[PDB]
Ligand binder design. Structure first.
Ligand SMILES: [Zn+2]
Ligand SMILES: [Zn+2]
Ligand SMILES: [Zn+2]
Ligand SMILES: [Zn+2]
Ligand SMILES: [Zn+2]
Lengths: 74, 301
């Protein structure tokens, strides 16, 4: 679709802030400029408890809040 | 034709499936298309068999795209498929491999997830099975090797959710049935991204595999071959010591079935783009990865 062909990707509205939204077509969610995303989920991570063994994205762990860290599953 | 196919761009499920049909039509003596099952959402699951004939030839399994967002893997799978038809009869080492062995290539192991990454959620990892208001299972936590043990999540909303029971996901059960019923796989290579790693078992336990010395040496050699093309640096080791404890995983299961040469690749890059690797790196990634895969195949033969 136009979104992907232009170099971007579809994301749920709740995962794409207004400032990162694009008008490109083909998504039944919204086209997102993924280069403008910040935080754990935006960088392909998942917030997990500190005791979970994982590959941490330390720069995004603060977005997960107390007792949590950002893990990226490969 | 597959000569005019654009290997330097990301494609849809349907485009990859059409590519399979074209490749088979062009090389009917070398490649055939098998359906190993039907996805949760009713899509055919396809494996390409590369073979020059024979009976019960030792086999190499390669799965790509088990985790849908890892787009570099499906793209590499398409390139591999073409490469096999190009180099058979030319490269003496690869010709010798296909004259003694069959290769089974699954380009899109999680087709429902793949479609979903294109139309709704680019960062979707899991299958799309439902029951819950949360969706999908981590298909690389669903295998019968430490299933449900530490290294996966029991929460259905989790990205590493193991599922209801081992092989609950038809995408996994289909491979399991196929490989067990075949009965003579000698290598099993699971292709993921990212991090630039070559991993051997185990993920689910700190116990070292009996074949650790050999697989570690094979990994070292394959990593050196990969690096020779563009200088791309890979590390290697067991899953649990290199990334994290992971249970219900594909190569842990395959190794436990007696498939010795069981490895998981983590392709480019190391975090700059992560899963969102630019299409301009598809070809260079696939080329270098092929050198690593060929090194493993050569040791198998
Ligand atoms: Zn499209
Ligand atoms: Zn993966
Ligand atoms: Zn389709
Ligand atoms: Zn050809
Ligand atoms: Zn060797």
């Amino acid at each position: 679709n136009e979104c992907v062909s232009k170099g971007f990707g579809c994301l749920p509205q709740s995962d794409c802030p207004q400032e990162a939204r694009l008008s490109y077509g083909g998504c039944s969610t919204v086209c997102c400029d993924l280069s403008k995303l910040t935080g754990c989920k935006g960088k392909g991570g998942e917030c997990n408890p500190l005791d979970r063994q994982c590959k941490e994205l330390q720069a995004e762990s603060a977005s997960c809040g107390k007792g949590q860290k950002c893990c990226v599953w490969l | 034709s597959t000569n005019t196919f654009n290997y330097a761009t990301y494609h849809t499920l349907d485009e990859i499936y059409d590519f399979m049909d074209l490749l088979v039509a062009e090389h009917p003596q070398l490649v055939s298309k098998l359906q190993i099952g039907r996805s949760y959402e009713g899509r055919p699951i396809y494996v390409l068999k590369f073979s020059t004939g024979g009976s019960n030839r030792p086999a190499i399994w390669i799965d790509l795209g088990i985790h849908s967002r890892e787009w570099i893997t499906q793209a590499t799978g398409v390139w591999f498929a073409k490469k096999f038809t190009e180099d058979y009869g030319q490269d003496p080492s690869f010709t010798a491999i296909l004259d003694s062995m069959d290769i089974f290539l699954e380009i899109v192991t999680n087709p429902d997830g793949f479609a979903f990454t294109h139309s709704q959620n680019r960062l979707w990892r899991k299958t799309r099975s439902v029951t819950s208001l949360c969706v999908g299972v981590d298909a690389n936590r669903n295998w019968d090797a430490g299933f449900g043990k530490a290294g996966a999540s029991s929460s259905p909303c989790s990205e590493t959710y193991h599922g209801k029971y081992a092989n609950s996901e038809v995408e996994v059960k289909s491979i399991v049935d196929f490989v067990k019923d075949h009965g003579n796989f000698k290598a099993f290579l699971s292709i993921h991204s990212y991090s630039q790693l070559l991993l051997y078992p185990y993920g689910y336990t700190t116990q070292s595999i009996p074949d650790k010395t050999e697989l570690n040496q094979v990994a070292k050699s394959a990593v050196a071959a990969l690096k020779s093309l563009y200088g791309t640096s890979y590390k290697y080791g067991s899953i649990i010591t290199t990334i994290y404890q992971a249970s219900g995983g594909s190569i842990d299961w395959s190794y436990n079935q007696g498939i010795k040469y069981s490895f998981t690749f983590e392709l480019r890059d190391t975090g700059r783009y992560g899963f969102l690797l630019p299409a301009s790196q598809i070809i260079p990634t696939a080329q270098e990865t092929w050198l690593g895969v060929l090194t493993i195949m050569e040791h198998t033969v």
